[PDB]
């Protein structure tokens, strides 16, 4: 297993940022994959998590204005992080539904007008 995340920058809010995350490796079609994030002092919560089936879940704090979405030519998973807030800033990280390792993420900043 290996989780790779690209992606990433300094936004401002109302502004819109892609993520990436790419599952090389062991079976990439077993479980889900999840995209979680983690402020300074907070603990690491759930973003959104996309199944096999294409079917998808998300925190009642980005329901709306991120996507999460799959290619599975390429096997990669997108974070669609749109009409960004100041909320948003975070470290964000992808995660496959059998658990394990963290991958070392991609750090996101929102500013203010």
């Known amino acids: 297993v290996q989780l790779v995340e690209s992606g990433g920058g300094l936004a401002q809010a109302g502004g819109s940022l892609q993520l990436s995350c790419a599952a090389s490796g062991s079976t990439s079609r077993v479980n889900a994959m999840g995209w979680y994030r983690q402020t300074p002092g907070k603990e690491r919560e759930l973003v959104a998590a996309?199944?096999?089936?294409?079917?998808?879940v998300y925190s009642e704090s980005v329901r709306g204005r991120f996507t999460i979405s799959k290619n599975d030519a390429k096997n990669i998973v997108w974070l669609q992080m749109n009409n960004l807030t100041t909320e948003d800033t975070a470290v964000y990280y992808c995660?496959?539904?059998?658990?394990?390792?963290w991958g070392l993420g991609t750090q996101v900043t929102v500013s203010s007008h």
């Open positions: 995660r496959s539904g059998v658990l394990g390792s």
């Open positions: 996309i199944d096999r089936s294409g079917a998808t």
